[model samples]
Target chain A: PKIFNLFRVCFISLLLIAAVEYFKYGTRINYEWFHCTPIKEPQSGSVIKLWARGGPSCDKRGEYKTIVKRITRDYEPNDEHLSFCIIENDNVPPVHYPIHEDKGEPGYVAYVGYDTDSELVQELCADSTIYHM
Target chain B: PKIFNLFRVCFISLLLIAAVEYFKYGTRINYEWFHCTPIKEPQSGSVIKLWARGGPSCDKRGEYKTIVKRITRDYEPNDEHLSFCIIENDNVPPVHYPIHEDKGEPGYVAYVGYDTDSELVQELCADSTIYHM
Candidate 1:
């Protein structure tokens, strides 16, 4: 009886193995391969300008003048040469930058006045989207 | 001639398929099957306590007294029935609650005295760890 049981187990295992082999070779499975491509583009010419006037009322000691000048002059624009510009004037209050009511509006002007001096600064502008940096 | 080439291709394909099947059915690859068993145990006894005190000198009309009393009375200990206690006194300073330096010390007492009416309220004590709320 023990020998018969062993034979039965071996027969069942052989049937299972044959079924697996049939599935592996007889069935069709889809396989695919892919590749990636990278590209680079050229830079364009545009200018961003920041203008500032110095007077007694402006924060001469507060370093706003230096920051505005550095941002306007040193920072490089991206592929399209588009960057930010900050304008400062002694006559204008610190809050005047970006002209609160006219956010995102091009060519908006802010006025600043000091007791001793009054000046207007203009920021040369361009569209900002084309730049990478 | 074309038929000969087709026959050669078919023959090679058949040989590859037979080799794969032979390896699958002939080679021994160990596989394992397992069953999961879950065990649950009885809930253990645990308790958490929060204590506070109120005084007029600390924060008059600030509701500290009411808040401390509520926390001591309502909040129940976990598996252990350990709860919090609060003391209030008009003469004592408000900074005495939890006795910052001696935190977590068992049986630490705080003293508060009022000019007119000074009374110390005692919270009921219990072994507290053996039972759940």
Candidate 2:
């Protein structure tokens, strides 16, 4: 009966795991992932924003300005950068990563993004894919 | 040698596919997918935004109001919805899906998300994951 008890335990554990998964993320989302989206691309009329990862003394303000200028200056080769924040509206606070202060670095970069369609905003975000509106 | 040539052809095809995939989605993105995300959840600061999928004749504005009120009124049960765009600010136009009118139906729904580390964005989107900022 020991073996039978083990099997029962396994079954119950599996069910419990399944239940946890189901509750954490319900099946209500209809999401899509495009494989071609390897590069960070922004739509037209998008306003690029940036954040520099650092401790108290770290200042990415200058870098932020440079990135914005470079991006808006007509997609220069040097504009090929990674990770920043993209918001639908600059007026908004804007959401990006390194918020918890765990991963940001001196030159830490993230993602850049804008709504492909149904837009009318300008903002910043960390991961563009996160803002894949 | 014939088999070798066939293998060569297959190899070339696979390489081509891989190349296309790389160029399309680039390998630079550091993405993460937590499978547990089966349900739609918003951060504390997130402002629930909504978009109704429908033809020109469909109207989701009325429904949108109800959802917002419900969310702000308190964590309600009916708020267990899926797909929406989350923005850091509401003043912007906002980025979202079903913008092309391909998937939007008479009463279509989408994901709702705000930056996990952030959001004051109460705008709407078609998918929450899309706004995973």
TM-score of each: 0.13, 0.20
DockQ of each: 0.01, 0.02
Q: After TM-score superposition, what is the CA distance of residue A31 in candidate 2 from its true location, in Å?
A: 3.7
**Cand. 2 TM to true fold:** 0.20
Badly placed stretches (over 4 Å) of model 1 are A1-133, B1-78, B92-133
Estimate the overall C-alpha local distance difference test score of candidate 2. Answer: 0.33
Q: What is the lDDT of residue A66 in candidate 2?
A: 30
State the TM-score of the second chain for every model: 0.21, 0.24
Name the 10 consecutive residues with the lowest summed lDDT in model 1 chain A.
A30-39
Candidate 1 residue pairs that clash: A91-A112, A91-A113, A91-A114, A92-A112, A92-A113, B46-B80
The candidate that wins on TM-score is 2
lDDT of 1 by residue, B38-120 (tens): 11121122222322323211221122222322322333222222222222233433233242333222112222211121111
lDDT of 2 by residue, B1-133 (tens): 3899999999999999999988655322211111001123443444443333333222222223223223222332233322233233233222222434463222223334334423334333423333221
In terms of lDDT, the best-performing candidate is 2
